[PDB]
């Protein structure tokens, strides 16, 4: 998988593609179609991180994602495209509440 | 909101753009957005009087801590009123304390509080709220927290 987490507005923001820069997040779409049939995306990257992740997890309200990669955790302020925060991991739990970790 | 993107250089303002909604913060409304803290028109009388018509009570008996101070943090500060009738002052310690305290609530009528904090050496205490408005007596006892 890539690292992505989706806001229930309807944007799964992922980053990267497979090893592409993280530079590419977004997707609020704009339109509707049949179950079987297929759909269109928006285009407006944000990001161009360096650390290569393997986790994405949303904040409990989607909001703050903490992303880990290269073994450290960048958390983003997302809309912000701000680094919400960073450090090195080993293992994790968000305090589910959406306010601690 | 309907969220619209910008070009700050020179923009565009167009009918289209799509909504997303973001949850905002709570508003809590206080007992100090509404009140003018005062000194009484007639304390002696008023003091009693306010009892007369108005008065609700709560008692606690305090057995793990013998200090006002916690209480104190919630009360001077929450109500925003004046402690007193010469019954305010305490140094970095003090044996006993009463705040007989004042201000007036919105809608005109007043909200009045007497807090006799009593130290035996536990604290057991009589908090009175007396009011010239009904909604405040129930409120003070809560609000102070």
PDB file of C-alpha atoms in Angstrom:
ATOM      1  CA  UNK A   1       0.000   0.000   0.000  1.00  0.00           C
ATOM      2  CA  UNK A   2       0.914   3.624  -0.082  1.00  0.00           C
ATOM      3  CA  UNK A   3       0.286   5.822   2.813  1.00  0.00           C
ATOM      4  CA  UNK A   4      -2.997   7.559   2.634  1.00  0.00           C
ATOM      5  CA  UNK A   5      -5.857   8.243   4.832  1.00  0.00           C
ATOM      6  CA  UNK A   6      -9.128   9.684   3.766  1.00  0.00           C
ATOM      7  CA  UNK A   7     -11.120  12.581   5.009  1.00  0.00           C
ATOM      8  CA  UNK A   8     -14.831  11.733   4.931  1.00  0.00           C
ATOM      9  CA  UNK A   9     -15.521  14.741   2.799  1.00  0.00           C
ATOM     10  CA  UNK A  10     -14.042  12.543   0.309  1.00  0.00           C
ATOM     11  CA  UNK A  11     -10.495  12.990  -0.052  1.00  0.00           C
ATOM     12  CA  UNK A  12      -8.213  10.213   0.306  1.00  0.00           C
ATOM     13  CA  UNK A  13      -5.128  11.806   0.376  1.00  0.00           C
ATOM     14  CA  UNK A  14      -2.408   9.557  -0.263  1.00  0.00           C
ATOM     15  CA  UNK A  15       1.035  10.485  -0.909  1.00  0.00           C
ATOM     16  CA  UNK A  16       3.495   9.311  -3.477  1.00  0.00           C
ATOM     17  CA  UNK A  17       2.213   6.783  -5.987  1.00  0.00           C
ATOM     18  CA  UNK A  18       4.704   3.963  -5.405  1.00  0.00           C
ATOM     19  CA  UNK A  19       8.069   5.717  -4.944  1.00  0.00           C
ATOM     20  CA  UNK A  20       7.089   8.996  -6.499  1.00  0.00           C
ATOM     21  CA  UNK A  21       7.293  11.917  -4.268  1.00  0.00           C
ATOM     22  CA  UNK A  22       4.818  12.327  -1.620  1.00  0.00           C
ATOM     23  CA  UNK A  23       4.010  15.333  -3.656  1.00  0.00           C
ATOM     24  CA  UNK A  24       0.517  14.407  -4.596  1.00  0.00           C
ATOM     25  CA  UNK A  25      -2.172  14.406  -2.194  1.00  0.00           C
ATOM     26  CA  UNK A  26      -5.640  15.547  -2.800  1.00  0.00           C
ATOM     27  CA  UNK A  27      -8.958  14.425  -4.182  1.00  0.00           C
ATOM     28  CA  UNK A  28     -12.279  15.961  -3.414  1.00  0.00           C
ATOM     29  CA  UNK A  29     -13.689  14.986  -6.734  1.00  0.00           C
ATOM     30  CA  UNK A  30     -16.764  16.574  -8.081  1.00  0.00           C
ATOM     31  CA  UNK A  31     -19.158  14.115  -9.768  1.00  0.00           C
ATOM     32  CA  UNK A  32     -21.198  10.835  -9.609  1.00  0.00           C
ATOM     33  CA  UNK A  33     -21.524   7.438 -11.586  1.00  0.00           C
ATOM     34  CA  UNK A  34     -22.673   3.637 -11.470  1.00  0.00           C
ATOM     35  CA  UNK A  35     -21.422   1.050  -9.086  1.00  0.00           C
ATOM     36  CA  UNK A  36     -19.588  -0.983 -11.564  1.00  0.00           C
ATOM     37  CA  UNK A  37     -18.409   1.867 -13.623  1.00  0.00           C
ATOM     38  CA  UNK A  38     -15.268   3.957 -12.909  1.00  0.00           C
ATOM     39  CA  UNK A  39     -14.526   7.616 -11.741  1.00  0.00           C
ATOM     40  CA  UNK A  40     -12.320  10.869 -12.168  1.00  0.00           C
ATOM     41  CA  UNK A  41      -9.701  12.522  -9.868  1.00  0.00           C
ATOM     42  CA  UNK A  42      -8.612  16.047  -9.189  1.00  0.00           C
ATOM     43  CA  UNK A  43      -5.001  17.258  -9.685  1.00  0.00           C
ATOM     44  CA  UNK A  44      -3.090  19.497  -7.179  1.00  0.00           C
ATOM     45  CA  UNK A  45      -0.209  18.051  -5.364  1.00  0.00           C
ATOM     46  CA  UNK A  46       0.994  19.189  -2.162  1.00  0.00           C
ATOM     47  CA  UNK A  47       4.035  17.740  -0.387  1.00  0.00           C
ATOM     48  CA  UNK A  48       7.468  16.564  -1.665  1.00  0.00           C
ATOM     49  CA  UNK A  49       8.801  14.992   1.478  1.00  0.00           C
ATOM     50  CA  UNK A  50      11.877  13.019   1.648  1.00  0.00           C
ATOM     51  CA  UNK A  51      11.244  10.255   4.212  1.00  0.00           C
ATOM     52  CA  UNK A  52       9.876   7.204   2.748  1.00  0.00           C
ATOM     53  CA  UNK A  53       6.992   5.898   4.725  1.00  0.00           C
ATOM     54  CA  UNK A  54       4.947   2.919   5.145  1.00  0.00           C
ATOM     55  CA  UNK A  55       2.276   4.220   7.490  1.00  0.00           C
ATOM     56  CA  UNK A  56      -0.411   6.672   7.316  1.00  0.00           C
ATOM     57  CA  UNK A  57      -2.879   7.132   9.978  1.00  0.00           C
ATOM     58  CA  UNK A  58      -5.327   9.757  10.437  1.00  0.00           C
ATOM     59  CA  UNK A  59      -6.072  11.693  13.371  1.00  0.00           C
ATOM     60  CA  UNK A  60      -9.163  10.860  14.982  1.00  0.00           C
ATOM     61  CA  UNK A  61     -11.153  13.257  12.946  1.00  0.00           C
ATOM     62  CA  UNK A  62      -9.081  12.408  10.009  1.00  0.00           C
ATOM     63  CA  UNK A  63      -7.188  15.572  10.577  1.00  0.00           C
ATOM     64  CA  UNK A  64      -3.678  15.009  11.918  1.00  0.00           C
ATOM     65  CA  UNK A  65      -1.967  12.232  10.265  1.00  0.00           C
ATOM     66  CA  UNK A  66       0.915  10.684  11.621  1.00  0.00           C
ATOM     67  CA  UNK A  67       2.984   9.216   9.095  1.00  0.00           C
ATOM     68  CA  UNK A  68       6.120   7.280   9.885  1.00  0.00           C
ATOM     69  CA  UNK A  69       8.974   6.762   7.536  1.00  0.00           C
ATOM     70  CA  UNK A  70      12.531   6.138   7.546  1.00  0.00           C
ATOM     71  CA  UNK A  71      11.604   5.126  11.150  1.00  0.00           C
ATOM     72  CA  UNK A  72      10.719   8.565  12.376  1.00  0.00           C
ATOM     73  CA  UNK A  73       7.294  10.119  12.540  1.00  0.00           C
ATOM     74  CA  UNK A  74       6.243  13.143  10.672  1.00  0.00           C
ATOM     75  CA  UNK A  75       2.861  14.140  11.544  1.00  0.00           C
ATOM     76  CA  UNK A  76       1.357  16.560   9.479  1.00  0.00           C
ATOM     77  CA  UNK A  77      -0.646  19.353   9.818  1.00  0.00           C
ATOM     78  CA  UNK A  78      -2.206  18.448   6.746  1.00  0.00           C
ATOM     79  CA  UNK A  79      -4.209  21.160   5.104  1.00  0.00           C
ATOM     80  CA  UNK A  80      -1.544  23.189   6.485  1.00  0.00           C
ATOM     81  CA  UNK A  81       0.880  20.976   4.838  1.00  0.00           C
ATOM     82  CA  UNK A  82       2.705  21.720   7.830  1.00  0.00           C
ATOM     83  CA  UNK A  83       4.684  19.414   9.693  1.00  0.00           C
ATOM     84  CA  UNK A  84       2.606  18.857  12.512  1.00  0.00           C
ATOM     85  CA  UNK A  85       5.497  17.038  14.294  1.00  0.00           C
ATOM     86  CA  UNK A  86       8.282  14.503  14.167  1.00  0.00           C
ATOM     87  CA  UNK A  87      10.499  12.027  16.118  1.00  0.00           C
ATOM     88  CA  UNK A  88      11.737   8.433  15.746  1.00  0.00           C
ATOM     89  CA  UNK A  89       9.553   5.569  16.448  1.00  0.00           C
ATOM     90  CA  UNK A  90       9.601   2.032  17.079  1.00  0.00           C
ATOM     91  CA  UNK A  91       5.825   1.454  17.784  1.00  0.00           C
ATOM     92  CA  UNK A  92       2.613   3.505  18.195  1.00  0.00           C
ATOM     93  CA  UNK A  93      -0.861   4.177  19.403  1.00  0.00           C
ATOM     94  CA  UNK A  94      -2.822   7.357  18.910  1.00  0.00           C
ATOM     95  CA  UNK A  95      -4.746   8.016  21.906  1.00  0.00           C
ATOM     96  CA  UNK A  96      -7.792   7.293  20.049  1.00  0.00           C
ATOM     97  CA  UNK A  97      -9.529  10.190  21.439  1.00  0.00           C
ATOM     98  CA  UNK A  98      -7.592  12.232  18.907  1.00  0.00           C
ATOM     99  CA  UNK A  99      -5.317  13.934  21.278  1.00  0.00           C
ATOM    100  CA  UNK A 100      -2.588  11.875  22.507  1.00  0.00           C
ATOM    101  CA  UNK A 101      -0.332   9.368  21.194  1.00  0.00           C
TER     102      UNK A 101
ATOM    103  CA  UNK B   1     -18.348  26.941   3.815  1.00  0.00           C
ATOM    104  CA  UNK B   2     -17.845  26.568   0.279  1.00  0.00           C
ATOM    105  CA  UNK B   3     -14.324  26.550   0.002  1.00  0.00           C
ATOM    106  CA  UNK B   4     -12.746  28.323  -2.808  1.00  0.00           C
ATOM    107  CA  UNK B   5      -9.016  28.279  -3.865  1.00  0.00           C
ATOM    108  CA  UNK B   6      -7.079  31.451  -4.437  1.00  0.00           C
ATOM    109  CA  UNK B   7      -4.539  32.869  -6.820  1.00  0.00           C
ATOM    110  CA  UNK B   8      -3.253  35.734  -4.691  1.00  0.00           C
ATOM    111  CA  UNK B   9      -1.442  37.258  -7.588  1.00  0.00           C
ATOM    112  CA  UNK B  10      -4.545  38.126  -9.313  1.00  0.00           C
ATOM    113  CA  UNK B  11      -7.203  35.518  -8.182  1.00  0.00           C
ATOM    114  CA  UNK B  12     -10.624  34.841  -9.788  1.00  0.00           C
ATOM    115  CA  UNK B  13     -13.918  34.896  -8.057  1.00  0.00           C
ATOM    116  CA  UNK B  14     -16.454  32.577  -9.668  1.00  0.00           C
ATOM    117  CA  UNK B  15     -19.772  31.039  -8.660  1.00  0.00           C
ATOM    118  CA  UNK B  16     -18.480  27.514  -8.469  1.00  0.00           C
ATOM    119  CA  UNK B  17     -16.282  25.999  -5.644  1.00  0.00           C
ATOM    120  CA  UNK B  18     -17.256  23.133  -3.237  1.00  0.00           C
ATOM    121  CA  UNK B  19     -18.078  22.834   0.449  1.00  0.00           C
ATOM    122  CA  UNK B  20     -16.497  21.012   3.121  1.00  0.00           C
ATOM    123  CA  UNK B  21     -17.197  21.720   6.613  1.00  0.00           C
ATOM    124  CA  UNK B  22     -14.900  21.659   9.429  1.00  0.00           C
ATOM    125  CA  UNK B  23     -15.937  21.225  12.930  1.00  0.00           C
ATOM    126  CA  UNK B  24     -15.362  24.260  15.008  1.00  0.00           C
ATOM    127  CA  UNK B  25     -14.820  24.776  18.735  1.00  0.00           C
ATOM    128  CA  UNK B  26     -17.326  24.939  21.495  1.00  0.00           C
ATOM    129  CA  UNK B  27     -18.613  28.032  22.915  1.00  0.00           C
ATOM    130  CA  UNK B  28     -19.414  27.796  26.557  1.00  0.00           C
ATOM    131  CA  UNK B  29     -21.282  30.804  28.090  1.00  0.00           C
ATOM    132  CA  UNK B  30     -20.129  32.068  31.445  1.00  0.00           C
ATOM    133  CA  UNK B  31     -21.435  33.718  34.482  1.00  0.00           C
ATOM    134  CA  UNK B  32     -19.268  36.808  33.831  1.00  0.00           C
ATOM    135  CA  UNK B  33     -20.127  37.733  30.354  1.00  0.00           C
ATOM    136  CA  UNK B  34     -23.402  38.859  31.888  1.00  0.00           C
ATOM    137  CA  UNK B  35     -22.631  40.255  35.273  1.00  0.00           C
ATOM    138  CA  UNK B  36     -21.444  43.458  36.708  1.00  0.00           C
ATOM    139  CA  UNK B  37     -19.689  42.607  39.983  1.00  0.00           C
ATOM    140  CA  UNK B  38     -20.729  44.906  42.698  1.00  0.00           C
ATOM    141  CA  UNK B  39     -21.030  46.056  46.211  1.00  0.00           C
ATOM    142  CA  UNK B  40     -24.600  46.123  47.596  1.00  0.00           C
ATOM    143  CA  UNK B  41     -27.236  48.714  47.640  1.00  0.00           C
ATOM    144  CA  UNK B  42     -28.098  47.362  50.905  1.00  0.00           C
ATOM    145  CA  UNK B  43     -25.979  44.615  51.986  1.00  0.00           C
ATOM    146  CA  UNK B  44     -27.417  44.036  55.367  1.00  0.00           C
ATOM    147  CA  UNK B  45     -30.777  43.858  54.348  1.00  0.00           C
ATOM    148  CA  UNK B  46     -30.071  42.703  50.919  1.00  0.00           C
ATOM    149  CA  UNK B  47     -27.930  40.035  52.146  1.00  0.00           C
ATOM    150  CA  UNK B  48     -30.621  38.559  54.194  1.00  0.00           C
ATOM    151  CA  UNK B  49     -33.351  39.319  51.808  1.00  0.00           C
ATOM    152  CA  UNK B  50     -31.829  37.671  48.968  1.00  0.00           C
ATOM    153  CA  UNK B  51     -31.965  34.643  51.140  1.00  0.00           C
ATOM    154  CA  UNK B  52     -35.583  35.279  51.813  1.00  0.00           C
ATOM    155  CA  UNK B  53     -36.844  34.926  48.400  1.00  0.00           C
ATOM    156  CA  UNK B  54     -33.884  33.207  47.057  1.00  0.00           C
ATOM    157  CA  UNK B  55     -31.730  30.584  48.375  1.00  0.00           C
ATOM    158  CA  UNK B  56     -30.361  27.256  47.370  1.00  0.00           C
ATOM    159  CA  UNK B  57     -27.738  25.475  49.075  1.00  0.00           C
ATOM    160  CA  UNK B  58     -25.118  22.897  48.733  1.00  0.00           C
ATOM    161  CA  UNK B  59     -23.024  21.323  51.497  1.00  0.00           C
ATOM    162  CA  UNK B  60     -19.915  19.315  51.181  1.00  0.00           C
ATOM    163  CA  UNK B  61     -17.832  17.867  53.990  1.00  0.00           C
ATOM    164  CA  UNK B  62     -14.170  17.831  52.997  1.00  0.00           C
ATOM    165  CA  UNK B  63     -12.130  14.897  54.369  1.00  0.00           C
ATOM    166  CA  UNK B  64      -8.892  14.417  52.184  1.00  0.00           C
ATOM    167  CA  UNK B  65      -7.826  18.047  51.891  1.00  0.00           C
ATOM    168  CA  UNK B  66      -8.645  20.802  54.404  1.00  0.00           C
ATOM    169  CA  UNK B  67      -8.094  23.622  51.933  1.00  0.00           C
ATOM    170  CA  UNK B  68     -10.427  26.204  50.458  1.00  0.00           C
ATOM    171  CA  UNK B  69      -7.989  26.851  47.738  1.00  0.00           C
ATOM    172  CA  UNK B  70      -9.234  24.442  45.212  1.00  0.00           C
ATOM    173  CA  UNK B  71     -12.636  25.796  45.812  1.00  0.00           C
ATOM    174  CA  UNK B  72     -11.144  29.230  45.750  1.00  0.00           C
ATOM    175  CA  UNK B  73      -9.677  28.711  42.381  1.00  0.00           C
ATOM    176  CA  UNK B  74     -13.093  27.888  40.983  1.00  0.00           C
ATOM    177  CA  UNK B  75     -15.093  30.607  42.823  1.00  0.00           C
ATOM    178  CA  UNK B  76     -13.290  34.142  42.624  1.00  0.00           C
ATOM    179  CA  UNK B  77     -12.357  33.369  39.140  1.00  0.00           C
ATOM    180  CA  UNK B  78     -15.634  31.701  37.762  1.00  0.00           C
ATOM    181  CA  UNK B  79     -18.123  34.169  39.158  1.00  0.00           C
ATOM    182  CA  UNK B  80     -15.956  37.284  38.705  1.00  0.00           C
ATOM    183  CA  UNK B  81     -17.371  38.877  41.671  1.00  0.00           C
ATOM    184  CA  UNK B  82     -16.136  40.472  44.612  1.00  0.00           C
ATOM    185  CA  UNK B  83     -15.376  38.387  47.809  1.00  0.00           C
ATOM    186  CA  UNK B  84     -16.221  40.328  50.876  1.00  0.00           C
ATOM    187  CA  UNK B  85     -18.275  42.313  53.264  1.00  0.00           C
ATOM    188  CA  UNK B  86     -14.749  42.613  54.715  1.00  0.00           C
ATOM    189  CA  UNK B  87     -14.440  38.900  54.077  1.00  0.00           C
ATOM    190  CA  UNK B  88     -12.072  38.300  51.293  1.00  0.00           C
ATOM    191  CA  UNK B  89      -8.539  38.471  52.613  1.00  0.00           C
ATOM    192  CA  UNK B  90      -6.445  35.567  53.611  1.00  0.00           C
ATOM    193  CA  UNK B  91      -2.586  35.670  53.749  1.00  0.00           C
ATOM    194  CA  UNK B  92      -0.532  32.584  52.609  1.00  0.00           C
ATOM    195  CA  UNK B  93      -2.604  30.985  55.267  1.00  0.00           C
ATOM    196  CA  UNK B  94      -5.636  31.952  57.384  1.00  0.00           C
ATOM    197  CA  UNK B  95      -7.818  30.088  59.962  1.00  0.00           C
ATOM    198  CA  UNK B  96     -11.452  30.665  58.608  1.00  0.00           C
ATOM    199  CA  UNK B  97     -13.099  32.268  55.439  1.00  0.00           C
ATOM    200  CA  UNK B  98     -16.360  33.815  54.126  1.00  0.00           C
ATOM    201  CA  UNK B  99     -16.747  35.354  50.965  1.00  0.00           C
ATOM    202  CA  UNK B 100     -19.977  37.016  50.976  1.00  0.00           C
ATOM    203  CA  UNK B 101     -19.740  37.990  47.289  1.00  0.00           C
ATOM    204  CA  UNK B 102     -21.266  40.362  44.617  1.00  0.00           C
ATOM    205  CA  UNK B 103     -22.573  41.218  41.217  1.00  0.00           C
ATOM    206  CA  UNK B 104     -25.771  41.526  39.228  1.00  0.00           C
ATOM    207  CA  UNK B 105     -26.954  39.201  36.475  1.00  0.00           C
ATOM    208  CA  UNK B 106     -28.340  39.941  33.065  1.00  0.00           C
ATOM    209  CA  UNK B 107     -31.991  40.401  32.559  1.00  0.00           C
ATOM    210  CA  UNK B 108     -31.474  42.831  35.326  1.00  0.00           C
ATOM    211  CA  UNK B 109     -31.575  40.566  38.279  1.00  0.00           C
ATOM    212  CA  UNK B 110     -28.883  39.823  40.515  1.00  0.00           C
ATOM    213  CA  UNK B 111     -27.169  36.951  41.554  1.00  0.00           C
ATOM    214  CA  UNK B 112     -25.952  36.762  45.059  1.00  0.00           C
ATOM    215  CA  UNK B 113     -23.570  34.318  46.852  1.00  0.00           C
ATOM    216  CA  UNK B 114     -22.432  33.729  50.344  1.00  0.00           C
ATOM    217  CA  UNK B 115     -19.892  31.225  50.873  1.00  0.00           C
ATOM    218  CA  UNK B 116     -19.175  30.474  54.392  1.00  0.00           C
ATOM    219  CA  UNK B 117     -16.357  28.154  54.204  1.00  0.00           C
ATOM    220  CA  UNK B 118     -16.066  26.592  57.677  1.00  0.00           C
ATOM    221  CA  UNK B 119     -13.001  24.950  59.013  1.00  0.00           C
ATOM    222  CA  UNK B 120     -13.406  22.808  61.960  1.00  0.00           C
ATOM    223  CA  UNK B 121     -10.361  21.268  60.699  1.00  0.00           C
ATOM    224  CA  UNK B 122     -12.044  19.404  58.032  1.00  0.00           C
ATOM    225  CA  UNK B 123     -13.790  21.873  55.979  1.00  0.00           C
ATOM    226  CA  UNK B 124     -17.493  21.491  55.894  1.00  0.00           C
ATOM    227  CA  UNK B 125     -19.103  24.354  54.105  1.00  0.00           C
ATOM    228  CA  UNK B 126     -22.192  26.218  53.428  1.00  0.00           C
ATOM    229  CA  UNK B 127     -22.423  27.732  49.987  1.00  0.00           C
ATOM    230  CA  UNK B 128     -25.400  29.845  49.524  1.00  0.00           C
ATOM    231  CA  UNK B 129     -26.524  31.338  46.432  1.00  0.00           C
ATOM    232  CA  UNK B 130     -29.350  33.696  46.873  1.00  0.00           C
ATOM    233  CA  UNK B 131     -30.325  35.742  43.991  1.00  0.00           C
ATOM    234  CA  UNK B 132     -32.536  38.333  42.723  1.00  0.00           C
ATOM    235  CA  UNK B 133     -32.843  36.105  39.642  1.00  0.00           C
ATOM    236  CA  UNK B 134     -33.996  32.288  39.782  1.00  0.00           C
ATOM    237  CA  UNK B 135     -31.842  30.999  37.111  1.00  0.00           C
ATOM    238  CA  UNK B 136     -28.712  32.224  39.040  1.00  0.00           C
ATOM    239  CA  UNK B 137     -29.086  30.385  42.358  1.00  0.00           C
ATOM    240  CA  UNK B 138     -29.042  26.972  40.612  1.00  0.00           C
ATOM    241  CA  UNK B 139     -26.358  28.359  38.306  1.00  0.00           C
ATOM    242  CA  UNK B 140     -23.998  29.732  40.893  1.00  0.00           C
ATOM    243  CA  UNK B 141     -23.671  26.529  42.601  1.00  0.00           C
ATOM    244  CA  UNK B 142     -22.763  24.957  39.279  1.00  0.00           C
ATOM    245  CA  UNK B 143     -21.055  27.870  37.654  1.00  0.00           C
ATOM    246  CA  UNK B 144     -18.641  28.413  40.361  1.00  0.00           C
ATOM    247  CA  UNK B 145     -17.125  25.217  39.301  1.00  0.00           C
TER     248      UNK B 145
END
